[PDB]
Ligand binder design. Sequence first.
Ligand SMILES: Nc1ccc(Cc2ccc(NC(=O)OCCCCO)cc2)cc1
Lengths: 498, 494, 493, 495
Amino acid sequence: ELHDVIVETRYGAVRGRSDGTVCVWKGVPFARPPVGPLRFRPPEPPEPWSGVRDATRFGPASVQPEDRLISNLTGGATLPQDEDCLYLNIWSPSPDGRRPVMVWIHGGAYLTGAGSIPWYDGTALAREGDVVVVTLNYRLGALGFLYLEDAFGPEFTGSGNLGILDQIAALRWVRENIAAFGGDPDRVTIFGEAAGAGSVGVLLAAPAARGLFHRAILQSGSGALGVRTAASAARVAARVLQHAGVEPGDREALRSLPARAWANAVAALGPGLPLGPVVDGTVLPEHPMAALARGAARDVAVLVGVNKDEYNLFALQDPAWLGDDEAALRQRVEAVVGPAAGRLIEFYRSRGEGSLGRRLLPLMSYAVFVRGMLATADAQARVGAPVWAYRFDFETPVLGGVLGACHALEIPFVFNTLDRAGADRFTGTAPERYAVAQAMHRAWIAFAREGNPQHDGLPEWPRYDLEERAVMVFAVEPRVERDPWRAEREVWAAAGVG
Amino acid sequence: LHDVIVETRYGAVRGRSDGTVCVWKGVPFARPPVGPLRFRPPEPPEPWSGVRDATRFGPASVQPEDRLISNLTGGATLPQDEDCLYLNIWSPSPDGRRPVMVWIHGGAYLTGAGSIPWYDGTALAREGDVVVVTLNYRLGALGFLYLEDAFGPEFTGSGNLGILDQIAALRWVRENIAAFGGDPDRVTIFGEAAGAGSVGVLLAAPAARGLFHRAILQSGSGALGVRTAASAARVAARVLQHAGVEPGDREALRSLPARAWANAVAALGPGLPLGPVVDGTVLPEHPMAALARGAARDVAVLVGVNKDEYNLFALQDPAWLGDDEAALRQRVEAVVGPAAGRLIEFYRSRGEGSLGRRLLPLMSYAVFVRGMLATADAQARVGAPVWAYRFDFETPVLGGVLGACHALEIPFVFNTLDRAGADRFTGTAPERYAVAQAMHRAWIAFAREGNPQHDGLPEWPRYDLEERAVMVFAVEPRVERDPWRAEREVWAAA
Amino acid sequence: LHDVIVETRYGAVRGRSDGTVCVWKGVPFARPPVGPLRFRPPEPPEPWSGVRDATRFGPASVQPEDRLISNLTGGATLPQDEDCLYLNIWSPSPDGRRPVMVWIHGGAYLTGAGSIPWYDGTALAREGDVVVVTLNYRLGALGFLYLEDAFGPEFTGSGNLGILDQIAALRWVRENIAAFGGDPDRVTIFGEAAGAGSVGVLLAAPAARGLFHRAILQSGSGALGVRTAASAARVAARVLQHAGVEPGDREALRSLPARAWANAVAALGPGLPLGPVVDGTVLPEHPMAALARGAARDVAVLVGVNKDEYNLFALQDPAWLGDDEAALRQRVEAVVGPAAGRLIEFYRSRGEGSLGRRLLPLMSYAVFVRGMLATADAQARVGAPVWAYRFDFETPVLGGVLGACHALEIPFVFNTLDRAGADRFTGTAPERYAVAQAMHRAWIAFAREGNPQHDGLPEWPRYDLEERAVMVFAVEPRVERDPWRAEREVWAA
Amino acid sequence: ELHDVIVETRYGAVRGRSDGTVCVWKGVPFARPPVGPLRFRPPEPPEPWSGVRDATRFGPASVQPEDRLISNLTGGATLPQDEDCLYLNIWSPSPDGRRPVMVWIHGGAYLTGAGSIPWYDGTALAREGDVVVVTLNYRLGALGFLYLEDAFGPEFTGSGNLGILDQIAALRWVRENIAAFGGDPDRVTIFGEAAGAGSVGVLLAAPAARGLFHRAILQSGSGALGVRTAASAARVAARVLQHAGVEPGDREALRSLPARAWANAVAALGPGLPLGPVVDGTVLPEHPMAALARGAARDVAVLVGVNKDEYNLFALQDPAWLGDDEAALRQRVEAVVGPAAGRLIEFYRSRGEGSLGRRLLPLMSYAVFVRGMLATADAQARVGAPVWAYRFDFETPVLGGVLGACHALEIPFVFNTLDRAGADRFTGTAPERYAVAQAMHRAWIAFAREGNPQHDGLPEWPRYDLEERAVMVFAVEPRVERDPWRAEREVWAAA
Ligand SMILES: Nc1ccc(Cc2ccc(NC(=O)OCCCCO)cc2)cc1
């Protein structure tokens, strides 16, 4: 029942596949392959081709270190990978028409992820919403985010944010090329999770990105999340360069090094967030939250949210977050909040259950996730942009119930990909989950369509405002909660850090 | 007893009437799925000259001997054939446009038939002035074998062949029920267990749209048994290996004796191996996703469970009478997996007596209750009329170990308590007859007027998110609001 | 606290006594294997005149971070250098001739040090009047990279540089131990996990013979981590490609920073890539084949495992705690291959909890339990004295999922429960003191008397094929006969 | 009538009082007063005195916090305190004779208590048992158990165990001088309750205590109970020093600070047992359970036991133990047992009857009390030391019987001091208490004199061993029950 659909981009015709209800194009190039001279340089428009370019198979992902997250609790796979990775994938109802478009930037801490990830499959989104879904690749890790301005001078300006430049390039392709695949360029929605949600925050600042997207969705991330100063990023690059063996100012060595050595050279740094968005002063002139506050996205409508137990996912990576040892927990908190650690540890210890660490995870959830979201939601209300806010409370039962409503759990609900690549393992197989999944997926569609996420599956969902801070909670029973983090908002306001 | 002859679109059929009710039995709604037609979508029956007998039941679908209730009950093995696609009609008279009740029997998608005496429509027909139809759908591998991997796209819908027969039966009812005195614009489908599981699929199924206006789900839901295509594809290979049919061998697929499929499927073991599959054609999406979206907003639904669903299965596996900690824990994990430990902890503390007895509500909640409650709330949110029930009448038999077990409610709705072997299942208590009537008239009311309210019952509000009123079937009937409130939270949270 | 000066064959070294025990730290037993000495067999240090400080620990071998244990211990980054060939001596007095216990640490041949606090020999020395040596050996590529094909004949034996270092430390102990209060002819070698894996190699290795009279194997065997020459070359070729050293590029090989080798090992991926190699010289044949022939017929053995070793590795991979069969099948099949179907079926029926949790014994048996019993069988069959143990004390951490996890016995054996964050590893139960003492004292009695029996324990029979008696450590010590009889049947067939 | 009886200690003559059946000396110093310079120093033998010293009145208690848990229920007045607190009290039938000696080390969590408290009154034991009874004061709180070896350097080594050192000084005094008061120095039994029992357990680990006792009784406490590691005590000492306003290395601040200020600083740390015996590596070379496991007390014969509802006393402090609030109860349990909390609560909830807190109270009894008893008892049996186990099941009916057989209830029973001020309120007024007391009062007497607690008022009382795990139950009808804690020992060990 699968049939071909052939469409011509400005650069060339591509052959994709349709069953008559949805068309899918995979591995469509939105930029020139960023290799050789183009490596550590911004994306350029793709080179034109004669003939019909095959889009039946997914394009190779950016060279990345292995992430246990994909392998351990998802069957997942080791992603097929290549330095020539600048490809996008399209799901759309029909090439005739002008449907709203949803543009997905994946997370994974700026080190991992792909648009091709099975749970990001756009078949359900395209069918349900009468919308177009695009997933794209952006350069990751050292090849994507190494800040070489201090190390290698002006020729590497913007090197800190080349992945962001990749996301900008893909958005330009959407505005330039999406019509051929059945989309409307004036109703484009960008949505991302984790590092992708960070990327959306950065995109919201970037003057270069302006006018590529009316609406943005930031899931389990914010413009604060992972963003770096030029100096901090310059030091990281030197540590990275040293593992690579590349002396600063050595152009021959930087091109010569194998891409896999670049992935490993970052991997040697150790667990955490070694690379992120850089405030380089060109691509990112200022901190994204600073630009957010000044009103850069006042015209843009934004939907932003977090999961109830955000940091709990990382306990799988770092098992100390289960122990009761007080000294170590302080050390982890110190890195997050610095000198204010003493004040916050005292507050959170009283609340919650279990070991001190179990009670401390909400502190971590707030600092990394909730603080960014609340700042994001608050900033928009002042500037007058319509904004809606959510918390994902659906809890996976696997691994004892320690995870709860953890980081990355919410993705199958938005994409309606519960059945995709045996997701049930991560979230469980409870029948109620379809209802909440349908509630979130249709809300996102509703937001992408009319700038209002309301639909019939959900109770009346009010706009987020400074006064009442209404939050829609996705759970087995959805409800709207006003200022749910008020205690957390105020304590962080008084503890010097918020 | 006088003969009654009716005309279907395909031919005349001869039935029987006692002057109160007319019964037509083994009326064929589809062509025999044999030879080339085997493992293929249902086809219209071949026209016959003459008046075809509708006095005798057709053969049942080929089945293993389950004997779960039959060992307790007087019940005996049904005659079986692959040519089993027949429906049975009881009606007061062929004249008229009465409300129609279409019954989907349970048995876990693997056993049962419309010919089972418990599904006799005489009582429903006489009391409520409706036409009641009972039907056969294809069971097991011949009904539900997912062959798309083995033989490719050509056998699309193999996963849902039994549901397609139900649709064909529903299409037949629109064509022919007028001839027997039913109104095709008033068709209600009602089922128990796997029957109810099929009912939830029908609310999703696009091809079923407009073949019915109402649904009744007993001890089952569209959550029950439904599998993904990948999950269904793996099950087929195990059945084929026991069958000894190579994937891609069409001749061997046809050459194989029909009985071999029952053995091949049965050898795999207890569970819900086969059920409706979310293949994307018959079932485009999981049945539960359709309920939330409001696909069944048109349909008035009556959904419920028995008070002690899981006790029935103790007849094969007797641990549930015991206090033994180790055995009960392992059983819980098989059904609910990672939540078992904590779930066991919550249920142990409530109630009295043995651990198994305290644990059985957990298992009732996992298998049956969860689907029923999700159905009602999806309907409540979209505002479709929904009523909920719990059946609390318990059987005295077996020392009361069953209580209000799975499948006990069947004679109560059908007013067939005095049918053979029903009382062995239900006991012979005098109080049971009023209980059967109280459910029965609310069942009749739901088909006839869309509201199950009647004089025997207290006021029964529609199910809503806020109050979640549920009618409790008991010697003294009462509405209980949000009876599952405490249990709802713990499954969702930690 | 006073300085103590003690004279080794190579030089004077300055230790310290609290009045009860004397400790020497950071005593060099070989020339630092740097520069030209890098990737070469260990050589005795150049002698020095005068007094060197031996109050401070030597540098550890360069190693990847052990996040799994380091989170539980909390320890800062380990000071590390290619110049890492140091051992540490605990003695009641430099005067005397006591039996000697020489410790080889685990860490999968890439990580660890003698400087790790759990291995502190004071409690054994103070309680047992024994000399304890803890040592560092070259780790990772600098210890175990097979370079014979890649860089030619200068690197004969390069697979076993870390094993050669252990022998060199044992030679230095032989000549110099009398000076530290040891008897150079009463030496028991004991290790855990990869340390016991080296012990198994030592029992097999011809050159090791006579450097030790007794062996203790905890959670390890001569099978552990050992690669055929063929397997080692395959892993070795990968490392250079990661490293960016071309084969034959000798100067780049010597010039490359030691940290860069460790990064290259991490790039190969998770597992046990590096280990002792059957090069035909250091290891003429496989340790288990040599043990069966009688190569270690002289050596007396105490051999054992913990009850639930593999639970620890579930922290890295939660699939073992989860029910996801395909990953578990991929995980189980990779070590046992075709046999896993039945084994997975065999284990599935028995036990409690998740499929992976029920499957966890399968991995424990494949990696540890089988090698232990193979080692014990050979020593009994050849006529060597051998004793067998199982450690059943359970950690309460992480909801008690770890149970008697891998390495749990280490604080009990050394009686280092008081050391920082050991109680985090072991919990706060008082019973542990009594369990530690049972482990503590029988380890002492095996070194001193050659028999693990002591008055606190019930009758401990020698492991033999007839009864297969194994002493079971728990809150109440008991002997269980043929405890794995059921599991032995299934694995063979 | 009370008339003077005069005996001369090595340090001088003492004037005590005889009723013609029992002689008592109060306020006898076994060490020079640890005040000023002697503060934070090991006890020093008293300077000898010429003359007849007044021993008619009890000596001052160690400076200690107020007690309300039992003091409010019974009615105790505020204890007289002074930094000069090192005094002991002797009960003896006559200065003539060679009796066995029972020396009592009181509980109070190393912060409170005294030997002079009426419940420990030794009159009945001497009169009934022909034994010498000594009760003593040891420095408490900050002065007793602060570990200053790290904070203040070598001069304060062993400061963590001064209270333990105070007890040792008294035992030496007993060895040298007890024959003067009509006792035998080599037939000495030490006995202690709660923290007192901890002191007895700890003393078994300490080398100097060896030979100062021949037998030991540990009641509702253990060598694990309250004992802190060198780092942990250093943690508390650092917290104590900050609260005190004493800079590390400032001896002037250390000496100058008022004793109450030492008590006030400790209170500010918050609820629990901040101070306790320290494994300093001098006084305490090893953990007492390690010392038992090594066999250090293999020759010492021990009698050890617990009460049925030890932790119920704490219900008076915290009503949650009567309440059904799960979240609050779990946090108190979690603080103690950490990761192990969840499974044991399931086990404990599975057993028992009544409220959630009621089911969680035995959890705290076993963790804090029962497991410590068993570790001591189990260690003793292994080395071949004679050991005996008991359980006291008599329940107080006060405040609705919710306390049951609470912690410390046996104390008046052991001494047969039920009529002493404030004891009837704690035990109730049932007639059955005397019958249970007589068997309990006499069992301690018989063990001290003969090393065996057996006597006629009790049924045949088997030695506790690992094989049978026999435990004598004291009740209105006393009975032997075997392995009464069987379920807990397995569940606590196993999973
Ligand atoms: N991913 C992975 C899988 C299996 C193994 C097997 C293994 C691990 C360790 C040892 N021996 C050892 O090193 O003992 C200390 C435990 C590791 C702490 O660094 C043996 C086999 C290792 C890593």
